[PDB]
Amino acid sequence: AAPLVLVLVVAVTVRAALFRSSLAEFISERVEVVSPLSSWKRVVEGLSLLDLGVSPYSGAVFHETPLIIYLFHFLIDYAELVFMITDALTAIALYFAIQDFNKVVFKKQKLLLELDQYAPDVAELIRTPMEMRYIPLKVALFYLLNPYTILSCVAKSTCAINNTLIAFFILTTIKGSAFLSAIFLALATYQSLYPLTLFVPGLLYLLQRQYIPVKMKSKAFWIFSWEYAMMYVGS
Amino acid sequence: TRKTYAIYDLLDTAMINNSRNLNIQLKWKRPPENEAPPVPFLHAQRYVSGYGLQKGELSTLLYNTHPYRAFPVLLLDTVPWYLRLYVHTLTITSKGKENKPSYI
Numbered sequence A: 001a002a003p004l005v006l007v008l009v010v011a012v013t014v015r016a017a018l019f020r021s022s023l024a025e026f027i028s029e030r031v032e033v034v035s036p037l038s039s040w041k042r043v044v045e046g047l048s049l050l051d052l053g054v055s056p057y058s059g060a061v062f063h064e065t066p067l068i069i070y071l072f073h074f075l076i077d078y079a080e081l082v083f084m085i086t087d088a089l090t091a092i093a094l095y096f097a098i099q100d101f102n103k104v105v106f107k108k109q110k111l112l113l114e115l116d117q118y119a120p121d122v123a124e125l126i127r128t129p130m131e132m133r134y135i136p137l138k139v140a141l142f143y144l145l146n147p148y149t150i151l152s153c154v155a156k157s158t159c160a161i162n163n164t165l166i167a168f169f170i171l172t173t174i175k176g177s178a179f180l181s182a183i184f185l186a187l188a189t190y191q192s193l194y195p196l197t198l199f200v201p202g203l204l205y206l207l208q209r210q211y212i213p214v215k216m217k218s219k220a221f222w223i224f225s226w227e228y229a230m231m232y233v234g235s
Numbered sequence B: 001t002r003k004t005y006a007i008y009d010l011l012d013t014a015m016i017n018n019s020r021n022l023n024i025q026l027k028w029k030r031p032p033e034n035e036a037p038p039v040p041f042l043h044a045q046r047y048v049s050g051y052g053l054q055k056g057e058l059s060t061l062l063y064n065t066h067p068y069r070a071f072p073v074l075l076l077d078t079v080p081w082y083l084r085l086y087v088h089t090l091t092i093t094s095k096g097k098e099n100k101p102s103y104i
Ligand SMILES: CC(C)CCC[C@@H](C)[C@H]1CC[C@H]2[C@@H]3CC=C4C[C@@H](OC(=O)CCC(=O)O)CC[C@]4(C)[C@H]3CC[C@]12C
Pocket: A216, A217, A218, A219, A222
């Protein structure tokens, strides 16, 4: 409890300290950190073009979705706070998802033990409750204190919002809600095209949580798959 | 400005005939520093700012040397596609204050 709050405080302090230094302008222009689809300067250019009466998409500099336009239209003044909030959000979502997943793993591994489908001498390969205690806190720390993430945050790159959407997809999937999972996957596919490939793994996890067998001669499998696909495409 | 011109009429046969042609001569040297004409009321310059091969700026300077009158100017610029421009960085400053164009 206290460790997570302390980690969050340290991460926010480092980001706030780097926002006020003389390296922010240098960081904001790195070709390793921003792209034609992520730069903040292109955001402000599009907003200015709208106020000059020109369509933002009539040139060659602005390649952002309209939802980004809406959001930053209403929050251009508070830009530096938004990115801190988003990074904290993705860290917290990953933390809780990992907690639930560890519970499932230990319970699944424990169930196999009595069906005695494991070899006689396989120990020291068995998971134990004492080692899985600090995995989620570590995961949060590895995301928040990675220099790549701090660099992305100080540059105000749009990639942070994409990462947040993916993390929320994972959280909602592991918690077992298909409607929210489809919504968040659709929002991730809307921003960048490639996340559509994560459709199959989430469907497999949901089917495994329902205890539905995955076979070609099954009826529940096809019904569940059809409903999930329809929700995603409609979104 | 009031200017005076000397006229040589080539169709006059007092000026040019079969037996005599025309060669005009003119005495002129750079005048002293005093008595030199004043500079024109309008002139301009253009240059590139920065260094490197990634980013830069295009700058123009416009001069008004008239003692008491202000007048408007119309400016036309064309730039190739390879030098991508960011229009939210456009600034026009006179005497340290911002000048807002009437038409753009
Ligand atoms: C392979 C291509 C055309 C992609 C689309 C997949 C279809 C081939 C799927 C969609 C629905 C499936 C059917 C859904 C339900 C059944 C019933 C199933 O048998 C039972 O339900 C019997 C119940 C019992 O007696 O226990 C046999 C397979 C079958 C015909 C499935 C065969 C494969 C189908 C046609």
